[model samples]
Target: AKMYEVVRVGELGLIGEIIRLEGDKAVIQVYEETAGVRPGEPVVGTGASLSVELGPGLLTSIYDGIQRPLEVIREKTGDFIARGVTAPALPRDKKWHFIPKAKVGDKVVGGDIIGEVPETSIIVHKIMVPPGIEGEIVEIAEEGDYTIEEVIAKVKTPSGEIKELKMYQRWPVRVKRPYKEKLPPEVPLITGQRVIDTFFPQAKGGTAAIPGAFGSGKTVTQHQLAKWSDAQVVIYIGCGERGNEMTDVLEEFPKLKDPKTGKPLMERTVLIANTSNMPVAAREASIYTGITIAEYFRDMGYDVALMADSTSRWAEALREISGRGYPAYLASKLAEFYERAGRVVTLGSDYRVGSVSVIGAVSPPGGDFSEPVVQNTLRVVKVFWALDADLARRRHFPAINWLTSYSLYVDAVKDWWHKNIDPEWKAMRDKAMALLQKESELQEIVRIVGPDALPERERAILLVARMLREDYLQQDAFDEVDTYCPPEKQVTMMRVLLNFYDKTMEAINRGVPLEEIAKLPVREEIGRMKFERDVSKIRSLIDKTNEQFEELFKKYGA
Candidate 1:
């Protein structure tokens, strides 16, 4: 593998192209931050690519901002040798102490404990030792495996397992919890946006792709899901993400209360930022870095929701680095990326508590899904929630083309739904589809001519569209009322609303005055019914409201 002359990169300043004869040196950014590179040292480039070390700690560990690799092993009674690597001190209690027996000057192999920090705990630690080298313990800063360019141990001819993480096709498609358990997802995933909930329903654990160019609603939609979705923990990875995007989370998350728990949502959130301006390598690292954190939380047994905004940028970084030829073999390169993404992520009650539900946003330049990046991702992931930029230009909140969006888990939750609602629920779903067809026609007519130009029947269909949008679709977090609809609430609300529409439309078809039909007290009553709510008490209110509507519709005639 020949190294290209990388005269300069993002953060690695300028350098003399070729330094010397035997050992040519060029100032290079280590991606993992550099500190003490001596003059005349051999500078090797990772071909401009980054890969995360995968093992036990890759998941289930909370991390600081920089994507540092580490592992923590609790000492047992048996004599143990640190096979992978050693930390400066195990920061258990507070003070600093060597990891016992391990000496700064003494020669040590790959797995040997030098000392023990009785009170000190381990900070971040990398497990894979720099191959087979007698490491000279540089400085025992802390007990963990991380040091800022401060090589805790330097190998004489470093060797062994140096992995380059990557992503590619042929990666396994595995389901995380909640989405697994063989249960179908039937409840509508309400986004409080009038258009999304009523028309293009997204189900829990259902996957959707938000493909947009830069500056599209990708980031905002990511935040919106984190704030409102029913998933428990949110794993947000800023994969080469813009700095201003993270600024949004940092500024707003702490202040926003969970619509469900009424607590700060940030506490349940984990952020893995590979900023737009971060090293291209680290930008690649950011995706897996975020997923590893998500996997870790998954091990803790929580309903984890992971969101990666624009994984394409990370892919682009990979393409640039691979082309440099520092690393050989394209398949291996792709696998390394997938190793970080965990395309074949394990879920179920087998490993973690609950499960991890991952939804990553794919930014296709100008909404182009045919690009290899988007095509590669589509191979392994299920659930594509595609957004339309053209529709977005017209101010559609979630411009999902309903016909294109499909969920494999939809039928899985049908049994559970049948137990909760009337068999008529399915019938109403069919009816809703028919009404949507009519609404589409009326909507296009209204678009061409004014809403007033439509005939009575067409006008009524337009109003139905409006009703679905305003009443069922429109929800406000700050309405002094609740609009957070969990799966249970969503099912009941849709049934009641649809049943009322069935009756209303029937009366209208029989020549009921458009004006009188619009004046029916049903609108105000249904508005007060609170369609989007989840509290047990609020649900009870909805149940009572449905009964009231059933009674009123039976009595009132056109």
Candidate 2:
């Protein structure tokens, strides 16, 4: 038995790899379902490892865990996935108009872009030399329509070997695509969600983990990011979620518009769906399939964002199959998944920069952060957008617990905010964060002695924190205007809240009662700041809020 060889076992064509052989009896780790297969049917060696196909048509296509096209399944099996059904991930019959970038006699190596194809209106698919190829072009195909399998170029090696090049390449899903260099993530991902963009921002090529319990808006948060993120490309892997959840994405993404391009959101998106009803092994492999595709686009120098909706199910698949038993280096597996995310210099000589920003949703059972998967994921990801079920129960959308959620990439992306939004953006963010933290501490005290008993200053802090949550932090995903918050507006909103706090504290120092300050007419406008769609109205509200604060302070005269 050959070591590290791939094989297909039995009548169902279950894919597996031979881990060890004990005298003709092979110990195989099957990647597919092994049910109803007689032992003596057949075990054929593929002579190839498990891999994913990377090419032009990947953007709008839907794939299962192992890169099997799901639309093919829906058409063949009547909207239900049939066991042991396999289909090609990319279409074989479709032809693309290939355009040559490098001519014949040009020396080329792996990762070198040889040509391009306008695969979609938004994406110009670059065809590159596959890795481990170093040769001079001997023959190049003229600009003509051809299938992916058709040879587009021929290269003559230094040793007099001729190799054919195609529009597609295959790489092992578990292995990361090579890059020239990995750069530190310095740019924010700019997810239009205010709490995230303003407070807990993730850099391009950074890793973020969204941990939540049932009905805590994990899926909603992920969907929002996919819809509004500034990345050039999106790879969404719905790993082990409900069938309806995947269906919602399948139905909605094509209809949604890209805020930047005003085109279909699906134009630059790839979906990998492995629902709860799918095979557990496939569910586990789905994340790799997605990241590999993201890396492919990144290798083309595109900023790609990949969202895995609920990795808990993926972790469970590992737990169920890890027969070495209870607790087997789960953290390491999680670390491996998150480590693939990074901003890197691609292998080519163009100095073209690309990034794969990973945002994985973690569904911790019973909303427990102490769970093994949640703990492991937290250790790896730089940004933690903790979704609190309690906040969701209060109908606070996003439900991101600001006190617990944090971003290690803050220092890296702070310069961008400082230059683009405001020079004092960092300080403003810190002040808001401090207020939230103080509220948490005061909450415990108030729980015992009650908030009314606290000092006026402490009560003011509590009120400001509430306003920050209800008005500034809480964003309605359904609202066309509030769904996307720009950084400038975010700064203005936070500053307005802080300004109110400062004015309230001055009023208290001048002997004004907390109840009297709370009754200000402008306080009502503060609550409605988030709902104000018009920028002019928002500016007007801010001016009115400050003006009213001044009028009240003068009336209470120090």
Candidate 3:
């Protein structure tokens, strides 16, 4: 048996993978409940490694880690999912109307587009020439409805051997699809979350780790991205989460609309749920399966965002697979996992731009980021969205702690901010973050020294900092308008707050009491500006606040 080969063990035909081969014996990790199996059972080798079927009907498909359509499995053997029960990833009989794009006698190589399927209302599923095959098109099927297994085109290799190609192709989940170039991901993937987009942004092809305690709102943050982020396709890997909770996703996601397409998010979403109720060994494969499918869409030049809710659970599965799975190999394993995420130029004559952004949620036992999994994850990921339990307990929606959370992609995508959002985007973001930092410093001082010990200017800083914290940083994901903040609106809101802080600071320097500036009614207006959706309307609110500030300035100056 080869390493990583998919193998069947015993008379039950239990699915397993060859992890180690030592002296005529293979150690296999069975991806099912290992019960009632006795000794002297036959072990069968399949010669093929673990793989996922990639083609039309992949999107919106609910699959388990092994690429088995869970719904189909449920139909076959009820919801209990009998042991060793396997199902095809794609339905065998469902015919798709495949449109031919490649001409006969035209030379086509690997990565070349052959035809496409209108898989969904919003997605054009391009059928490409499978990798490592190049030939002259000998026979071609005209545009017609056919099952995925039906041959659509025939490529005669240079040696005059005909290779029949189908719309359906399988790619190993553990292997990365070929790409021509790994582009520098300078473009930002705007999630419209004030905290994520403006404060800690991730580039189009970036890796982010959201590590926190169980109640730190990781799922809420992930849900917002899946629904609202600018990615054309979203692949959610439910790694070792609750089965009933994933039911919430199954029931709710179909109703949620995509912000860009205005269609149901299910139209563009693919879910791989290896729930906690499922076998643990299967959870180890879910991330790879999710990425491979995501990469399939990316190969067709679509921006794909993959969210794995809590990778620590997957790592635990990895830990147990080896019987005594050493932690030493974990770093490289995780590094390899995150390294696959990037913006790339696909390998083909017709160059198309695409990116795969991976955001992994990590549940650190006892909320300890210093734990092995979180630390290893942080070593590779570009963004660290540190979710704070205290902030969540305070009713903050995202609960991403400003002080701890950061994005290295900020500089990479800062120029994008300048051109798209605002010319002074970098400065605005920096000062706002600096103000938060300053607030935390003063908060420590206020803890023991008390508010009375501080001077008026410092007191003004505290008030404005509070405004930044609640009005700007805090967001209500449930609110209609506040759910997704446009880049321009975010900028205008930031501009408004900084202006208030500047005006208030000047008032304090001019001998006006902190309470007088704090009493200004415009503070409430600034606080509620998050609910205002329109950028132009927000500008008017800023103007009104400025006018109100003018009156306060005149009253103080006189």
Candidate 4:
């Protein structure tokens, strides 16, 4: 009768949702193959909405959209699932060692952590009181092995009703979780990509959108963030990539180690794989499923980041069902999705803070940014990293156009950068950006007036711009040494590049040829700075380069 209610349609029992209620007859969009069912068959609503089970067994498992475990589904129904075949998302029988935190007679309410379980080696899953439940703990379980379905505690309600508590809870996927208080997202999610971290930084509880063309580095940039961002938990929604691309994530992510803990990255990572060939409606389910898991961890007082790889597929799914009011209501739905991301103080007695940062990839048709999805996403998300198709053709890694891409979190996270890196971190960023902007202007002039027409100082700016592009902004996700540049290393690298710029300008001011300063052996060292792993070594390399710049300063001025 209501929208999005889980329904079983026809004799085949195909999964569907109540999308439109037209009089007594509802228009249901079946999620699986719906052929061969005769008219006037049963359409059974489950009396509840679509929900994902939140519990200990979530991580390290891959699921198709709608929280059906792909591995378990494959075991039951082969590579491609047959219609109506199903299994519980979380195993019902597996016992987890639950360490009880609340004792008898403790006054407890919804969102109170009752116990904890070691879900993975790196993550301890916190079991909380289900929302809207409040009572005094009349009896509590011991720290012992128990299945998620087992009753671990008993609570007597204020109205004198006994309620049993379990380790797992079912949450409606589209509804946002409750939090005690919302907080400003000032802390940066320290992604190791130079283009992201140094330039378009996203706050720990921020929202960012990456819109790029086919063959651009949108997916690669997203993968690097999942690998190296400083959030405690990662939820990657593989929403609608090609089949082979989805296979790549399945094969690669399991073997990859967490750069922080050295354990398998899957230990703290949840993968929601929805390839392009799956049901379009399920693509919508995958995004909600992924974010609900993210908010679950955020409620546990952990910093969580969810990366939705290309939300364009979900929008396409929306557009397919024209009765759902597409284009007109697209912005509102997009806003509702991003509104779920933020820093918040969680509920109950826990005085802990957590965050959910969402970074969604938007692929526009023909690399166009004026499309409805990208435009609407840009209206909501604070950070925008547009990968330029022109730069991709030139083989520029990251290829984020400096002028077009920006982050609103710069002022908010500037204090973190100052205390974390150097006092002049923002200053260096400003100068570099201004130089990049100036270079674009000069290049426009160069296209018509030729390079022979520029002043020496302007020419020097152009040379420094090239240095910035090649040495600092460019990154190699495949190269181990260059893949992840720590913030300290990145700052030191910036110091040398800008330090060379100052020296270059000074030498020019003192009558030295631009060519002479450009030919300095130190330029090559600055170019290779991304490959150097040791930040302290790069710090010393700063001094070594400064000494070389001092020689240039003396050779020209004297």
lDDT winner: 4
The local distance difference test score of each candidate is 0.45, 0.76, 0.77, 0.77
Model 4 lDDT per residue over 387-451, tens place = 88788889999878778898999999989889978888899999999999999999998999888
Clashing pairs in 4: none
Worst 10 residues of 3 by lDDT: 22-31
- Please give the ranking of all candidate structures by TM-score, highest first, separated by commas: 3, 4, 2, 1
Candidate 2 at 255: error in angstroms? Answer: 3.5
State residue 131's C-alpha deviation in candidate 1, in Å.
22
Please report the TM-score between candidate 1 and the true structure: 0.59
TM-score of each: 0.59, 0.86, 0.88, 0.87
Residue 219 C-alpha lDDT in model 1: 53
- Badly placed stretches (over 4 Å) of model 1 are 1-66, 69-206, 212-220, 246-264, 318-353, 367-372, 376-381, 386-408, 420-427, 445-456, 477-483, 528-558
Model 2 weakest lDDT span, ten residues long:
3-12
In lDDT terms, how accurate is model 3?
Answer: 0.77
TM-score of 2: 0.86
Across residues 398-444, which tens digit of lDDT does each residue of candidate 1 receive? 55544455455445445444676444445555566567677876667
Colliding pairs, model 2: none
TM-score of candidate 4 to 2 decimals: 0.87
Name the weakest run of 10 consecutive residues (lDDT summed) in model 4.
Answer: 76-85
Cα lDDT tens digits, model 2, 199-296, are 89999999988763557887678778987888889998763354345445545667878767788878898988765455565666778888999999
Question: Candidate 4: which stretches are off by over 4 Å?
Answer: 1-46, 71-85, 275-277, 310-312, 319-327
Candidate 3: residue 436 lDDT (0-100): 88
* Stretches of model 2 off by over 4 angstroms after superposition: 1-42, 71-84, 105-107, 157-160, 246-254, 310-313, 316-328, 369-371, 512-516, 533-546
